[PDB]
């Protein structure tokens, strides 16, 4: 394929991310950024990463009867931790903060005597 | 369109989660303050 | 696209419930010191 022979099958119904190695050879060997992550058998030519909410990243390669293949960089950014700063939430954050400290201050006033 | 659905919900849920965790930390600092006065005064 | 928001909305209820329990003990313990 011009020596770009590892693909990604995305847009699944579930969040999984699957990688395909484009060759034909027994004893498929899978790399991950210059090092092994395990052997493989045949009839199952896909390597599983996980759900996209864990946003996997890295460089991967697939081996074959030929020489070293070329890597692929995967970059996922699914937020799952987004916070809105729209001048309305920060207003509610400061209000709850100032009220709590004011209330605790009245208690410490009475504690001294 | 369907842009509102669940994305608008999860933005406010994260805000409240970290806001209410901070108020829970404020209670522990008062508990340490009060429990020293109680222990000393009551011996 | 997902339903993982549901657990987050369920965990927020637990944090709010615990706040009331911590409010009670702080109020309760201050009274004993004042009503010595």
């Amino acid at each position: 394929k011009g020596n770009h022979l590892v693909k990604v099958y995305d847009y699944q119904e579930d969040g999984s991310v699957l990688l395909t190695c484009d060759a034909e050879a027994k004893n498929i060997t899978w790399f991950k950024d210059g090092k092994m992550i395990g052997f493989l058998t045949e009839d199952k030519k896909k390597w599983n990463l996980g759900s996209n909410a864990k946003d996997p990243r890295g460089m991967y390669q697939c081996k074959g009867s030929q020489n070293k293949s070329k890597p692929l960089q995967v970059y996922y950014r699914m937020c799952q931790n987004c916070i809105e700063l729209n001048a309305a939430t920060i207003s509610g954050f400061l209000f709850a903060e100032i009220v709590s400290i004011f209330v605790l201050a009245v208690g410490v006033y009475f504690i001294a005597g | 369109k369907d842009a509102n659905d669940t994305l608008l919900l999860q933005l406010t849920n994260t805000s409240a989660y970290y806001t209410y965790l901070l108020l829970l930390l404020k209670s522990v600092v008062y508990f340490a303050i009060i429990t020293c006065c109680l222990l000393r005064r009551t011996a | 696209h997902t339903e993982k928001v549901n657990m987050m909305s369920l965990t927020v209820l637990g944090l709010r419930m615990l706040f009331a329990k911590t409010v009670a003990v702080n109020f309760l313990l201050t009274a004993k010191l004042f009503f010595l």
Binding site: G92, A96, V99, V103 | T12, A16 | R16, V23, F27, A31
Partner: peptide, 27 residues
């Protein structure tokens, strides 16, 4: 629209703080 559900929790959380304290001035 659950910010109102967060709004009224605050206004009535401190209303119990003042009310419970007044129970012991008059008793």
């Amino acid at each position: 629209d659950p910010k109102l559900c967060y709004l009224l929790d605050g206004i009535l959380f401190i209303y119990g703080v003042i009310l419970t304290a007044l129970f012991l001035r008059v008793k």
